[PDB]
Design a protein around this ligand. Sequence first.
Ligand SMILES: Nc1ncnc2c1ncn2[C@@H]1O[C@H](COP(=O)(O)OP(=O)(O)O)[C@@H](O)[C@H]1O
Ligand SMILES: Nc1ncnc2c1ncn2[C@@H]1O[C@H](COP(=O)(O)OP(=O)(O)O)[C@@H](O)[C@H]1O
Lengths: 745, 313, 160
Amino acid sequence: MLQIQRDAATIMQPYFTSNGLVTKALEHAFQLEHIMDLTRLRCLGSLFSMLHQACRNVAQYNANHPDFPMQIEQLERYIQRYLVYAILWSLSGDSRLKMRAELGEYIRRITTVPLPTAPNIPIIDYEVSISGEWSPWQAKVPQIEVETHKVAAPDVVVPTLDTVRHEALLYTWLAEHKPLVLCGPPGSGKTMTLFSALRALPDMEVVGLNFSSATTPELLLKTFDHYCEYRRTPNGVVLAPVQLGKWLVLFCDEINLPDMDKYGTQRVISFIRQMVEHGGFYRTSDQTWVKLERIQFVGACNPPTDPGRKPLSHRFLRHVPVVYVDYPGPASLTQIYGTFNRAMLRLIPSLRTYAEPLTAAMVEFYTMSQERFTQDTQPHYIYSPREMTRWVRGIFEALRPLETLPVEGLIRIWAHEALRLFQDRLVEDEERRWTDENIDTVALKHFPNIDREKAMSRPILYSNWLSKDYIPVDQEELRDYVKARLKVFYEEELDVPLVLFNEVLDHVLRIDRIFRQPQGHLLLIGVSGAGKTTLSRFVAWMNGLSVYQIKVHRKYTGEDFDEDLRTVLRRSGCKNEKIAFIMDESNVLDSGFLERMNTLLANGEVPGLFEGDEYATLMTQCKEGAQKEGLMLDSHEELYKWFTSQVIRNLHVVFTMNPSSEGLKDRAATSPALFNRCVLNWFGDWSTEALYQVGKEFTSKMDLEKPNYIVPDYMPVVYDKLPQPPSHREAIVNSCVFVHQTLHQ
Amino acid sequence: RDPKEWIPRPPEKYALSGHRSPVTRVIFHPVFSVMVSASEDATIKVWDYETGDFERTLKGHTDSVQDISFDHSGKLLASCSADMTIKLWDFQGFECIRTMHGHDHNVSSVAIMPNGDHIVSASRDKTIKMWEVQTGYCVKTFTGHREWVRMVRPNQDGTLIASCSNDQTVRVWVVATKECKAELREHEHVVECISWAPESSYSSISEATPGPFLLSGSRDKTIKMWDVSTGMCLMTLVGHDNWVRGVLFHSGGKFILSCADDKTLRVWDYKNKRCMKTLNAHEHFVTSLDFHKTAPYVVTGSVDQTVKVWECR
Amino acid sequence: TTWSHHLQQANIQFRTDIARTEYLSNADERLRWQASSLPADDLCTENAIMLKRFNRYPLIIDPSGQATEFIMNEYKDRKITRTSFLDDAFRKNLESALRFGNPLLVQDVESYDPVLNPVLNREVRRTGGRVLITLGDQDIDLSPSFVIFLSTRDPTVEFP
Ligand SMILES: Nc1ncnc2c1ncn2[C@@H]1O[C@H](COP(=O)(O)OP(=O)(O)O)[C@@H](O)[C@H]1O
Ligand SMILES: Nc1ncnc2c1ncn2[C@@H]1O[C@H](COP(=O)(O)OP(=O)(O)O)[C@@H](O)[C@H]1O
């Protein structure tokens, strides 16, 4: 190892001294602009680590070829190209595609090093193999197909150019235990890339952490307490994972998010910088230096230009390389979801010729919806490939047991899923009509000679209550069924009468659709008194979900919330009962409430929540529950894993809050899980249409008909689609709607 | 034809109407040819099937009647309502025998074993109570459920009773050991209807897979049968389109009878793991049904205040 | 005026030559109110009409203190136990009122606690002929003749 290190050093010596190549490349990369501010030491340390991994690669090749070791000529040809590759991925890894292309063409212009001959293929699209030649990544990525069982599973990762390049980068970083940051927009694929890289290393265990705005180092201390232990050594106190021989990697998803103090500092970031540079942290229990044996880090963050994020300190960025993952774009997303649609459209063999136009329509609609609803208009108007993954998963779940479906039905389920993913979060009627019209015109453009009236209609509702299959339903029969179910429901849980209308039908269908899937958390935005809690309670009762209310009152400290969470998690994981954790914004008092909600909604487990004899009680209860279920568990790690999996499988959290022009932004800053792991349903205030139907239904059982009624010539109308000529009851319910509107005015 | 192969065919032989509230349970008298139904209008209605005519009015309850049960002779009738009362009726007198109290909530179910020495009932007060026929006293109360018990049904000899709750679990009990034999936590929703296999069905179930054999029907649109000896799901039957509220075994032991919330009644072949005939029962939802051991007649309660009498062939 | 203009525009005739105090309150009940320390103003009489014909339990923003005395004088035959939200002996008085079916008046609603949300929302369970409501950790039967009034002495208070 020392000999091959010396040979590599002697062959890369002419490229380092004075100007050479690295100095000019660095001074050009400084002129280039990046996502994060580029300190020279960060990229230099990144380049040094990648060259060390090159030496390790040569050593492993020598081990794999014991008869013929590494020849000096092939070694020099390999190093002379790995140096260019590493310089490119070090000085351009945190920038955009066009800027890394500019750095590549500048390097090609300036260097006297052999390079592949390509009129337009960038040097960044190449790999220096161990044989010493340039192997393109396009030959490395295959045109694979996935089975119908895993169509949109969280673990399936179809490979692309950017995917395999970031795979190689993350393997190179994690092979020598160096912290790294996966910066990029939400939904870009950073945690998917990290998990797919970690599953190629069987010697590492991943820990998921989600930072909030009110993040303190006590969260990392609790994680270290839960997943590691303190061991006394003659050289000091050493913190090591309990899993012997396994390297623990901590995944922090919101590095940029913790609030910067008034003096420009972040306590968690300074803590991480201290334990990265010095290799340890001070324990406040007895003021003793605690050293880390096998603890590495990986970070994820949105770009600092995002409204809720803060730039990182250069002293922390010095040790930590950052790579910028961008959105896949149209030309890659087309095959990324083309393989998924060709895999899923095998259950119905008569639709296999429509997978390519289906993918084209989905990509076109997603791109043309991305451009309009920017984050400037609303804080939750973020669109990501996570929405397309949920789209194909929903179409697969609707097409799974159906076994027979025409093209009109396929485009109609496409339109319904598009509505559910691109209308629930929307606010205004104008933009809702925009989405509806654009869905219609996209279907018209990409699906010619089809039955438009049969494919597209007004209600487009789908229930699984009238039938086991996920069939479309009609509004009148659905309303009759909901009437009968409410008549049954009044005598069991809540004896409060309700009036039903189309908005209520849509809301209960959406809430049932989100309750049916695992790990389904709601976020209902609307004015108080709109019936969100009652509708959620009715749907949870009809789906067989227990409803939990924390019953907040005076002097509600954090301990009461913690014991409520302990009871909810215990009954949801050990007793194995479906529970609908419904709680309003008024139930939130302190920042610890929202921190625990962030952790539970993100990972499904709260580290440090069960400490002391309650942890032993939880372990005994989980062992008893595993015995009752019929699968044996020993130790404590797999018991905790099974309990966590049960919590994801069972627990559903419903969050209700009033809309606000600053409260929503503050909530998004202080809890990203509410806007990431929860679907945002914007109930809003009751529309004039809803008020009109409520008034017309409620004022129907009393005598209000005058046969001699004169139609006014001016006819002041505030509810659109009013029948002409209106009757007396029509006029008075329109007057009631006008009265409500003038109170608003 | 032979009693083994009595199957219902459309349409219905009789169309009865006149109730002012949805029908809960319609069951067969064991001796004489008189129909009787229980509804939620605080009364019990009496009809006929060989002529399809009104017979007599029984008005003793004050709140919504939930369940009714018969003895072996048919001379005793036990009914339960929402007034936390238990009322007894007779066939030889057609009057009120006794009025009992002690339940803390609505009494969901009552059951009379063929011995007839005492009447067991299940209520919504998280308890199961059995009361004697000579004194009307709750000598022993079965407890151990956490939600309201929906239906209770013992076996043919009364040596082992079973009950269903909302804990996705059916519990079997013994009138001597006073403790649960086995807990059966396999369903995913509320269990509503429980049936017991006759003596003729034991060999059929054994050759399809001793006894006794237990079948449980739940709201999860699935029907499964269970065995006391092994405590394991024998086979899973899937295909009921909506919520299942009533199940019953065939007297021949080869088929089953069940009703669903989709306004249909279906007959299933557990040998072929598939149904063989589906009929549109009523214009609205249905609740329960029953089958006669000898007479070729089958009825089905409903919600639209209509009871339809079907002749098997 | 806006509602009357709209109803005139929509050709729905309404009695213009009437007072909203006189059409809603009878002479005998007006005399009873004036005997029970109510001010003779038409605004105060309209407030009394609202306090009589309420459906949701009302909140009284009365800095002068006369409306509290008017409430205690109007509901004088029925016992009223005056208490405050911040008082430690408030929940016990609430359960006593819920059990015994007598009107209750609570002041200082700026210190509002969400324990009264099931009561204000009428989240009630029907046990046949028995009416049941559950708040906190105890189950209490609800009498039909129970009314609760919230009082305030600060006008410039912001309510969620
Ligand atoms: N190349 C790809 N192949 C398959 N799925 C992809 C690809 N790129 C993105 N995805 C989808 O995007 C999602 C990744 O988003 P995620 O990494 O969770 O973003 P963030 O970590 O910023 O929240 C995954 O659910 C995945 O299905
Ligand atoms: N569609 C409706 N018909 C009748 N009453 C309704 C309807 N929607 C809401 N309500 C009334 O409004 C109240 C809303 O209560 P809740 O849902 O707890 O508050 P929020 O609407 O803020 O979630 C209910 O008590 C109910 O009586």
